[PDB]
Amino acid sequence: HCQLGQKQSGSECICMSPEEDCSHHSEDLCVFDTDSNDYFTSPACKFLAEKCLNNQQLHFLHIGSCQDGRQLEWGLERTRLSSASTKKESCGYDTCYDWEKCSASTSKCVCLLPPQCFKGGNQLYCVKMGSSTSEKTLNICEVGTIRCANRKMEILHPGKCLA
Amino acid sequence: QVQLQESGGGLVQPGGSLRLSCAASGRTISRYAMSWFRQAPGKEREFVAVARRSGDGAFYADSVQGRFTVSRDDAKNTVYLQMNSLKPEDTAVYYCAIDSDTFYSGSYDYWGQGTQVTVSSE
Amino acid sequence: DVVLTQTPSTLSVTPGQPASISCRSSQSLLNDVGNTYLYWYLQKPGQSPQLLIYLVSDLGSGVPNRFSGSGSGTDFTLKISRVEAEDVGIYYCMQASHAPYTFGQGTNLEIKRTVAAPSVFIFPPSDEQLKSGTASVVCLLNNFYPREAKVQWKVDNALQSGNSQESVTEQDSKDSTYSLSSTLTLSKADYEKHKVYACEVTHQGLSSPVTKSFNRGEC
Amino acid sequence: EVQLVESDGGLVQPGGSLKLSCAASGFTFSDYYMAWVRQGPGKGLEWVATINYDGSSTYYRESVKGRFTISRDNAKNTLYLQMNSLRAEDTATYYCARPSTEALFAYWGHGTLVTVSSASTKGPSVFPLAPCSRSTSESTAALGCLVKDYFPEPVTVSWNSGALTSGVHTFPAVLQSSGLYSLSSVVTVPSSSLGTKTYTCNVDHKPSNTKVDKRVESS
Numbered sequence A: 001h002c003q004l005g006q007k008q009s010g011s012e013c014i015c016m017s018p019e020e021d022c023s024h025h026s027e028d029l030c031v032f033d034t035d036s037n038d039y040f041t042s043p044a045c046k047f048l049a050e051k052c053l054n055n056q057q058l059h060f061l062h063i064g065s066c067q068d069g070r071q072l073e074w075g076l077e078r079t080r081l082s083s084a085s086t087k088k089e090s091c092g093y094d095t096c097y098d099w100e101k102c103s104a105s106t107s108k109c110v111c112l113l114p115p116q117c118f119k120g121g122n123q124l125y126c127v128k129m130g131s132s133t134s135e136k137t138l139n140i141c142e143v144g145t146i147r148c149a150n151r152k153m154e155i156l157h158p159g160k161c162l163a
Numbered sequence B: 001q002v003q004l005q006e007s008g009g010g011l012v013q014p015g016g017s018l019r020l021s022c023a024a025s026g027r028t029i030s031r032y033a034m035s036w037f038r039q040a041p042g043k044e045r046e047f048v049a050v051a052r053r054s055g056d057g058a059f060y061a062d063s064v065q066g067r068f069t070v071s072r073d074d075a076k077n078t079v080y081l082q083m084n085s086l087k088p089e090d091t092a093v094y095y096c097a098i099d100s101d102t103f104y105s106g107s108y109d110y111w112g113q114g115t116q117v118t119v120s121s122e
Numbered sequence C: 001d002v003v004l005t006q007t008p009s010t011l012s013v014t015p016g017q018p019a020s021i022s023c024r025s026s027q028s029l030l031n032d033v034g035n036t037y038l039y040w041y042l043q044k045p046g047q048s049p050q051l052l053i054y055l056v057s058d059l060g061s062g063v064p065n066r067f068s069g070s071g072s073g074t075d076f077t078l079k080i081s082r083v084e085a086e087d088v089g090i091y092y093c094m095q096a097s098h099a100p101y102t103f104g105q106g107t108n109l110e111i112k113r114t115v116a117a118p119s120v121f122i123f124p125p126s127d128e129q130l131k132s133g134t135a136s137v138v139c140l141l142n143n144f145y146p147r148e149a150k151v152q153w154k155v156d157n158a159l160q161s162g163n164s165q166e167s168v169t170e171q172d173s174k175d176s177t178y179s180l181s182s183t184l185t186l187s188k189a190d191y192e193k194h195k196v197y198a199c200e201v202t203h204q205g206l207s208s209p210v211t212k213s214f215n216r217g218e219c
Numbered sequence D: 001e002v003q004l005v006e007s008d009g010g011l012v013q014p015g016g017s018l019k020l021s022c023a024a025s026g027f028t029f030s031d032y033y034m035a036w037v038r039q040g041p042g043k044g045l046e047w048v049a050t051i052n053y054d055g056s057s058t059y060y061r062e063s064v065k066g067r068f069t070i071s072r073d074n075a076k077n078t079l080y081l082q083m084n085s086l087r088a089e090d091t092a093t094y095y096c097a098r099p100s101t102e103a104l105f106a107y108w109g110h111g112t113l114v115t116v117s118s119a120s121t122k123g124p125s126v127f128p129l130a131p132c133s134r135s136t137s138e139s140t141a142a143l144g145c146l147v148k149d150y151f152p153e154p155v156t157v158s159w160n161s162g163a164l165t166s167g168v169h170t171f172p173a174v175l176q177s178s179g180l181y182s183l184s185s186v187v188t189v190p191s192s193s194l195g196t197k198t199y200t201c202n203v204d205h206k207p208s209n210t211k212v213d214k215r216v217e218s219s
Helices: A044-052 A070-084 A140-148 C127-131
Strands: A006-009 A012-015 A028-033 A038-043 A058-063 A089-091 A094-096 A100-103 A108-111 A124-129 A136-139 A153-158 B003-007 B018-025 B034-039 B046-051 B058-060 B068-073 B078-083 B092-099 B108-111 B115-119 C004-007 C010-013 C019-025 C038-043 C050-054 C067-072 C075-080 C089-095 C107-111 C119-123 C134-144 C150-155 C164-168 C178-187 C196-202 C210-215 D003-007 D010-012 D018-025 D034-039 D045-051 D058-060 D068-073 D078-083 D092-098 D112-116 D125-129 D140-150 D156-159 D168-170 D181-190 D200-205 D210-215
Touching: A028 A044, A028 A070, A038 A044, A044 A058, A058 A070, A058 A094, A070 A140, A089 A100, A089 A108, A094 A100, A094 A108, A108 A140, A124 A140, A136 A140, A140 A153, B003 B092, B003 B108, B018 B034, B018 B092, B018 B115, B034 B068, B034 B078, B046 B068, B046 B078, B058 B068, B078 B092, C004 C089, C010 C019, C019 C038, C019 C089, C019 C107, C038 C067, C050 C067, C075 C089, C119 C196, C119 C210, C119 D140, C127 C134, C127 D125, C134 C150, C134 C196, C134 D125, C134 D140, C134 D181, C150 C164, C150 C178, C164 D181, C178 C196, C178 D181, D003 D092, D018 D034, D018 D092, D018 D112, D034 D068, D034 D078, D045 D068, D045 D078, D058 D068, D125 D210, D140 D200, D156 D181
Parallel strands: C010 C107, D010 D112
Antiparallel strands: A006 A012, A028 A038, A028 A058, A089 A094, A100 A108, A124 A136, A124 A153, B003 B018, B018 B078, B034 B046, B034 B092, B046 B058, B068 B078, B092 B108, B092 B115, C004 C019, C019 C075, C038 C050, C038 C089, C067 C075, C089 C107, C119 C134, C134 C178, C150 C196, C164 C178, C196 C210, D003 D018, D018 D078, D034 D045, D034 D092, D045 D058, D068 D078, D092 D112, D125 D140, D140 D181, D156 D200, D168 D181, D200 D210
């Protein structure tokens, strides 16, 4: 009945304590901390208790203990972009943003491809994409799918291109 | 010539079981579908089952679906009809036949002489 | 171009039984952030394709949960746990992991039923057509299963070849049978040079061939 | 309800031009990318082009570049595909598609047929398919009508203006060696009904603006 990181207490449904209620085993996660600006391995029990307690500076990177690589690197780029996202969809341990679909069968945030982006009323950005001298206007979903693809681009300013 | 000979015919109670076999000679059956037909005395000969080549499936008559199973042993050049849950309406002479058309149009050119299956009625 | 090679190209499944279709990719569809853009589509007969599975194993909206997907890298599989008649059609895998987007060649899904021999009918050419200088003779093989059959035209016992064309329907949505039409085409002059016209039909459900025939000059 | 309606296809001689259109409704058209996908006679699927929200970015299959142009008019809620220098290998049914968060091609139109051919449009002759004899002992009787010598596809056939559907089989068209198409539609009925009820096939070949109602009786 109770949500992730929570525990039943006297008909209430309160958060868990990371240092008291996680003496059992749980799978290792790789997590990032905005304050210290370092990532580290953490038990899933402690991480979910922290997110119940609104530790917004703590972000999910990937399942298992930390391994450097592109997937870890992209996890750090997600965190810097997450302030620009209006969707904050819970998805397993992760939180999916405007440029991602929650894959329910795997509990993984999966980056959309650019043509899947619903423009709607998303915030626009003027950008230049590498090896070119022609500005283009992109919304935040589009920008996120491009960074996820590891594609060369530079943002120039918020809002549509003035040209 | 291509010789087919059925065996296994006998009498059984209703609900019982029988395994017919049909051994071929004069040609390798492995490239040909093999089919079972049956004919009650004084009635018309009707399809029962067909075992196509290995992997191309088996197909059955409406009256025997779920009760009868057809299979092959290409090394033995033999096909079998496993008959289960027999009923008095299964009483007939049972024939095997080879489909000479490898594309499965049902060119039944060679037939066995048949083996008698009797179900005890009453 | 990533080539998706599906296996089998055809399969027949009794209603209620499970079904499995595989899709082999010439290049791994897993990317360097752990995502795999594989999709499965169904094109029912006479309709446009519709999504079934996205991202290997996620179920499309409004799709029944007896459809499932699995796999990784280059090998992927669609599974139907309990096939129904409405699932008949052609199933395609599609990848968007490497541009250009590419589809598989398709896998035909047939509804398996019990054997039914064809009912055969023969139609002579119409008097209206004969006045125009051509004679089409039609042989209908109706409501039979399995799909394979042979039509053999004979005109005064001379076996015809290269004269005829045939066409078979899609699987009937209600009784899962097929029907087949075969049209023998002659000039009016050749048609009136002969008497007996017959189509001889064989099917694995027939113990011997069925022949329907008419005598010209008795219609 | 999301809805996409292709049109402005049809017959075009080789090297000629065509501009397909696709009318969208049921969603904010200018909020989405759009794409064209085609399906040739072999029933493979092949992505053609994609367009971004306002048409400032376009993407094309390599076999099509310099010949097709994808465009859109968001004030009219319409997607287009100009197609120049058309080849026989461009013959296909062309679908417009809209993505979703699940797939690239989530919503599909019904498609518009594009036939690239030098042959000319021609309407069919409709002939009856009736037995040589009125009934015989048989408890069932088959009758039909043969829709012969038309071009391009398609024709539609109904029976008794849609009131008769049970037992109807309308076969796929066959391309005969003259280059024109031919098909047949048939229906099985109880032989008792051949004096009480009438049977009329309604043929429609829209490319030639041909409508024919053919009553079928046994001579």
